[PDB]
Design a protein around this nucleic acid. Sequence first.
DNA 1: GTCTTGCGTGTTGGAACACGCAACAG
DNA 2: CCTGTTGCGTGTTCCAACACGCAAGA
Lengths: 141, 140, 135, 140
Amino acid sequence: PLTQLSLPPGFRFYPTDEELMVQYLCRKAAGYDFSLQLIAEIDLYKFDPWVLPNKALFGEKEWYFFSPRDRPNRVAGSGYWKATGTDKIISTEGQRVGIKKALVFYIGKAPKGTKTNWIMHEYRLIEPSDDWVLCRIYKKQ
Amino acid sequence: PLTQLSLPPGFRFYPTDEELMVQYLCRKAAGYDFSLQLIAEIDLYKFDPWVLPNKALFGEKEWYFFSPRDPNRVAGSGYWKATGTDKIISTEGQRVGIKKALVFYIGKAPKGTKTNWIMHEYRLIEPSDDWVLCRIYKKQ
Amino acid sequence: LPPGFRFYPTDEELMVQYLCRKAAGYDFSLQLIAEIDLYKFDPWVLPNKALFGEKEWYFFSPRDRPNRVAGSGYWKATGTDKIISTEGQRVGIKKALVFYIGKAPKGTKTNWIMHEYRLIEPSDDWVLCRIYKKQ
Amino acid sequence: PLTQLSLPPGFRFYPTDEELMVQYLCRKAAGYDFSLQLIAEIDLYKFDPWVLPNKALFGEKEWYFFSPRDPNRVAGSGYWKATGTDKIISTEGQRVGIKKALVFYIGKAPKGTKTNWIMHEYRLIEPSDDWVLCRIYKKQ
DNA sequence: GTCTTGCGTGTTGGAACACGCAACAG
DNA sequence: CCTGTTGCGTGTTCCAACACGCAAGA
Ligand SMILES: [Au+]
Ligand SMILES: [Au+]
Ligand SMILES: [Au+]
Ligand SMILES: [Au+]
Ligand SMILES: [Au+]
Ligand SMILES: [Au+]
Ligand SMILES: [Au+]
Ligand SMILES: [Au+]
Ligand SMILES: [Au+]
């Protein structure tokens, strides 16, 4: 799924925050198509993070996904995800287009759960008062 | 030199220390297609690094070169000064290369003032074509 | 009294050497922690009423037998009220407050803080309060 | 060394960063009574910090020392490693001192493992007796 | 209580800044 | 030779993400 790219050796996906927003988040959302499906659709909140890697179509230490947008410490699998730091803003050409928000997995039942090195980055579209978020998943260290 | 490859958005050139040594540097001696065509042969030490960005086949805040394998070798109005700890690069538990850090100083040694231009000089572990591969970028 | 030296009582001393002494009604060599009715005041006038202290002032106030109004505002309880122990016996609770100015719950927060120490007890009655302004 | 002073309960030694510099460190050169008698002269770098608590004239979870004014100076089975941001200490808008954070590592640099033993090394801003004042304590 | 997102504030190893032993040439 | 003038090691200072775990609020 990375292969028929014939990618030369040494080349990897190191998208900027802005590309994930524009080339990934926008493309899917206006519902326009991709040459290849690279970032698969998944329901991220049905799972333990550690099984997630197997479901992403490419990636060694980061895996990326699309998940239905929520309509807080949202439970997922055997645990719950806790929001961290100050959710951050993505800009392009002086327009705010998205928020990148970080998470940490706690296993268990809140707020007595135990922290892991499992991380999620949730990208979301900025918007006014086919609805997805884009998530980077990885395990720290 | 990128657009023949038909890249999906988001892909950039981020080779590991282990790949530059293994997939790039040794392979140059071996004649590989994608490796011959992706990095410019250039003598880094005939130039000021800030002339160098224009001499790279592509690149955004970093550039890579092969330069003839040869201390504080003069280049332009300065000299490249080694910094930090030379690193041993290993592949599959076998040692293949060494990573060396450098900083560009302007003026005449050792009375130069340090600048933000940086070099990483990588060489293979092997006895006496014969190149080092260098990354150039500007800090901060 | 000598230099470089300041009152940095542990939670436990305030409970034992301060709260207990006054409550069994035993006396002090000097009155250090004055009696005041803390709930009659704006926190910012309080500093002038304490007998010593540069950024923390301590007081004793009659014990209540919630967002208790005081002056131009109301005090809002915060965090999880905490327990003081000595030699394995629970003797007190330290409870933190923040001053809101105005009328609850639409008042506005300040950096004015109270720490209220109270005696643990079974199912001449005082609390001990640390006052300070944050930052 | 406390009980000559007749302390009321609750009083402890909590000097400000500004006082340690002003009331303690400069005054040592000036010969003041209460300052000579309250802090032990000791060479912190000849010892492991955990031997040090017993070498302090008093203290509960922190200890203070004067140590001869002199990088990763060896002490015992380790080295003290600088951490955080050196701080400028000012008095009445005049700069008098610098505060430096340190961590004790056990073993041999730079292959030691970090421990919970901490030092704060305070020095006066002034040209070339001549001491630094150090606080020692243990995390957790 | 219950179940958050926030925001301070803290720790780690990365990265150059800079020393003085090295090593050759004059 | 023994001094000169010119690098490379390496140790210590630095600073910046990356998040901790609390405590406010919803
Ligand atoms: Au956009
Ligand atoms: Au958009
Ligand atoms: Au699995
Ligand atoms: Au090789
Ligand atoms: Au008032
Ligand atoms: Au006033
Ligand atoms: Au008691
Ligand atoms: Au109170
Ligand atoms: Au001074």
